[PDB]
Curated annotation (Swiss-Prot), chains A, B, C, D, E, F:
Region entry 4 X 11 AA tandem repeats of [EGS]-K-T-K-[EQ]-[GQ]-V-X(4), spans: 1-31
Positions of post-translational Phosphoserine modification: 51
Protein name: Alpha-synuclein
Sequence repeat coordinates: 6-20, 21-31
Domains: entry comment: The 'non A-beta component of Alzheimer disease amyloid plaque' domain (NAC domain) is involved in fibrils formation. The middle hydrophobic region forms the core of the filaments. The C-terminus may regulate aggregation and determine the diameter of the filaments.
Segment of the intact protein contained: 37 to 94 of 140
Tissue: Highly expressed in presynaptic terminals in the central nervous system. Expressed principally in brain.
Family affiliation: Belongs to the synuclein family.
Localization per Swiss-Prot or TrEMBL: Cytoplasm; Membrane; Nucleus; Synapse
Species this protein is from: Homo sapiens
Amino acid sequence: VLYVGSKTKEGVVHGVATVAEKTKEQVTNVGGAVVTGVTAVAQKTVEGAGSIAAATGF
Amino acid sequence: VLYVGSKTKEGVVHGVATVAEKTKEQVTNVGGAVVTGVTAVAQKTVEGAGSIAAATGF
Amino acid sequence: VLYVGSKTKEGVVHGVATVAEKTKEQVTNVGGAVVTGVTAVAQKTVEGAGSIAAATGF
Amino acid sequence: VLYVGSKTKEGVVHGVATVAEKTKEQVTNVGGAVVTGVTAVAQKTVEGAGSIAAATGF
Amino acid sequence: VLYVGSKTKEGVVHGVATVAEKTKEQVTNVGGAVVTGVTAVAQKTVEGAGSIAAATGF
Amino acid sequence: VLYVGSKTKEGVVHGVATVAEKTKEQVTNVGGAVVTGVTAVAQKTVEGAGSIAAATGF
């Protein structure tokens, strides 16, 4: 609301360093969501919002 | 509400260093959500919001 | 509410260093959520919000 | 000397992933060698050869 | 000397994943060698050769 | 000398994952070697060779 010289880092992912030799991601879905591999979602304010993998269904 | 020179880190993931040689992620879903692999979700305010893997169903 | 020069780390995951040689994540769901692998969720204020693996069902 | 279908990785550095926010390298030498920062020297056969920081002197 | 379908990794560094926020390397030498920061030297055959920080002196 | 389908990892460093927030390396030498910070030397055959920090002196 009122900052007088601060330093903020609200809602941050910092450093996802990753090392791999092989990678075989094998997804076969039908009617839903799938998210694989590296993922670095970063939000500050989520006002009743969705997931990172949503499946509403019927 | 009022900062007079502080230093804040509200809602942060910092450092997800990872080392692997092989990786075989094998998902076969039908009607739901799946999230695999490295994941570094980082939020500050979640006002009644979703998950990181939601399955609403019927 | 009022900081006069403090240093805060409210809601932080710091350091998830991980070392592996092989990895075989094998999920086969039908109607629910699944989350595997490294995961570093980090939140500050969760006002009656969701999980990191939700299954609402009927 | 004789390979009949192998797969070799003799003398390799593989993956030096690095994440930083600030960096202040401050060297003041007079009569010697200095090497700083990321360095990924990679050799196979070193037949009585030099270092990665040599100082012969008098 | 004789490989008939093997898979070798002779002399390898694999994965030096590193995460940092600040870094202040402050070297002041006079007559010798200095090596700082990340370093991933990788050799196979070192036939009476040098170091990674040599100081011969007088 | 003779491999008929093996899988070898002779002389390997694998996984040096590291997480830090601050780092202040402060070296002031005169006539010798200094090596600091992360270091992942990896050799297979060292036939009477040098160190990773040599100081010959007089």
